[PDB]
């Protein structure tokens, strides 16, 4: 599962058999990384209108 | 069913007779108005490619 975003630390406890998380949109801002079993949320890179 | 319209109100028309009020209520009601919506903007680069 690839993308671009900023990952920090994360208060949603996953399920163990959960991977990815998704929002009420299907877009993935809740990750686990597969090394040590952590959740974090994927924030977008601040895009903006100049 | 098959609805009904309204109450049937038979007027009591003659060519001599009126109807004239003896009070008054002060009604307030409510209209609703849309004004404006959410203002969107989408990145259409973004949007179709990331
Ligand atoms: C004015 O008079 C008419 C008749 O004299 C009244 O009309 C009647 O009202 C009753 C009440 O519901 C009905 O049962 C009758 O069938 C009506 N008759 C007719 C011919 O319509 C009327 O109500 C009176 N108006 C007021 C404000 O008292
Ligand atoms: C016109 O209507 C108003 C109410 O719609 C009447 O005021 C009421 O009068 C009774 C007895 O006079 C009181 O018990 C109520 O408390 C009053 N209501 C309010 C809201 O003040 C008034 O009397 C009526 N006038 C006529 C000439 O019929
Ligand atoms: C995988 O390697 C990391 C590296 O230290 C270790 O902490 C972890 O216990 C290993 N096993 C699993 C199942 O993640």
Do not use: W
């Not at chain 1, 920090?8 to 929002?23: A, I, M, V």
């Not at chain 2, 060519?15 to 259409?44: G, H, Q, R, W, Y």
């Amino acid at each position: 599962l690839t993308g671009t975003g900023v990952l920090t630390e994360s208060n949603k406890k996953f399920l163990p058999f959960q991977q990815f998380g998704r929002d009420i949109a299907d877009t993935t801002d809740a990750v686990r990384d597969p090394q040590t079993l952590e959740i974090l949320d994927i924030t977008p890179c601040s895009f903006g209108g100049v | 069913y098959t609805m009904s319209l309204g109450a049937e109100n038979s007027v009591a028309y003659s060519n001599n007779s009126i109807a004239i009020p003896t009070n008054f209520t002060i009604s307030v009601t409510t209209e609703i108005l849309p004004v404006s919506m959410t203002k969107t903007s989408v990145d259409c680069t973004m949007y179709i490619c990331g």
